Each structure stands twice: as C-alpha cells, then as structure tokens.
C-alpha cells in the first residue's frame, strides 16, 4: 500500500515499479553442495 508526496503535500504522478525476490538456500557449493536452488525466482510489477 504505497503512497508518495512532495515536500509541501502534493501528489506525484509517475510510474511506481516494485520488484521482490530472494535466494533459495545457498548451501555453499563445490566440496559442499555444488548446484543448489536457482538464482531465485524474481517477479516484477509496475503501476501508475
């Protein structure tokens, strides 16, 4: 639930884009656990 305001209390027309993701497990790799998870599935939306 996002809003944005100028210094003197004015609405700001513009584009607001939000991107949310993360890593999966990151065990360590190599002599540990070489291939693991993904790059993290990253999603993305944008609004006006």
């Amino acid at each position: 639930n996002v809003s944005a305001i100028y210094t003197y209390g004015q609405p700001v027309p513009g584009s607001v884009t939000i991107k949310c993701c993360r890593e999966a497990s990151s065990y360590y790799g190599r002599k540990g656990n070489c291939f693991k998870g993904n790059r993290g599935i990253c999603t993305n939306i944008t609004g006006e």
Binding site: A24, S25, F35, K36, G37
Partner: protein
C-alpha cells in the same frame, strides 16, 4: 516405431527439480507400448 522395432527416448531433466530438496532419490518411469490395430498394450514400470 516400425522399421525394425526401436525407440530412442531422450528425456530432458530440466523441468525436473534436479539440484533442490524436492528429491526422493527415485525417478519412477513407466513405458507402455501399443499397436495400431489391436488396442492391447504392454506396460513396464521401474525406478531409476
């Protein structure tokens, strides 16, 4: 098939989650062979 009886079934593992914790250490494979005229089929299942 039909030339002499042969099929080279390459299966891509990319849709499978190789590299994560969705493992059961077992990949169940079922193979069924039918015939054009007769509706009879032969089924063969095994665990990789």
């Amino acid at each position: 098939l039909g030339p002499d009886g042969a099929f080279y079934g390459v299966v891509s593992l990319l849709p499978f989650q190789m590299g994560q914790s969705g493992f059961q250490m077992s990949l169940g494979v079922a193979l069924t062979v039918t015939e054009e005229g007769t509706g009879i089929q032969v089924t063969h299942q095994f665990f990789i």
